[PDB]
């Protein structure tokens, strides 16, 4: 009953955003709640933010 088929492949690159779900190995799930700017994050004496 078919005549011709056409298959198309889109390659979308999904970045990260609030609502996503991350997790370490030891069973500590989580959901991202914010993306702070670089300068709000805490920094040690050297200035390197976490």
């Amino acid at each position: 009953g078919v005549l011709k088929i056409v298959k198309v492949y889109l390659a979308v690159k999904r970045r990260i955003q609030p609502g996503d779900k991350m997790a370490g190995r030891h069973g500590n799930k989580g959901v991202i709640s914010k993306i702070n700017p670089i300068e709000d994050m805490p920094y040690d004496e050297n200035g390197t933010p976490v």
Binding site: L3, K4, V6, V8, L10
Partner: protein, 50 residues
């Protein structure tokens, strides 16, 4: 009747038919987004009765 893969779709704006080639199928490399047309097709339909 048999459906077709016409590159000319009834009453669709020219902006939507920008990436479809003359054969009807989208080019390989185009950046499509929500709502765009990837493969033009028209199904016959008579007996209007408006």
């Amino acid at each position: 009747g048999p459906e077709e893969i016409t590159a000319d779709i009834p009453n669709v704006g020219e902006a939507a038919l920008s990436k479809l080639d003359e054969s009807g199928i989208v080019y390989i490399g185009a950046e499509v987004t929500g709502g765009d047309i990837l493969v033009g097709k028209v199904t016959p339909k008579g007996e209007t009765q408006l």
